[PDB]
Each structure stands twice: as C-alpha cells, then as structure tokens.
Amino acid sequence: AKVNIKPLEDKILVQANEAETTTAS
Numbered sequence: 001a002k003v004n005i006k007p008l009e010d011k012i013l014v015q016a017n018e019a020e021t022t023t024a025s
Contacts, residue, residue, distance in 0.1 A: 002010070014021060 010021075
C-alpha cells in the first residue's frame with residue numbers, strides 16, 4: 001500500500017511540501 005507504494009516519494013515530497021503533502025492542507 002501507500003507504504004511500499006512510494007514510501008520515499010512521500011519523504012522526498014513532504015520536503016517540497018514543507019510538511020503538507022501536496023497542496024495547502
């Protein structure tokens with residue numbers, strides 16, 4: 001699931017997010 005499903009993509013993204021995830025949370 002999300003886990004193995006882009007586990008880093010959520011760790012390398014959150015970065016460009018600042019802590020959000022994708023957009024304004």
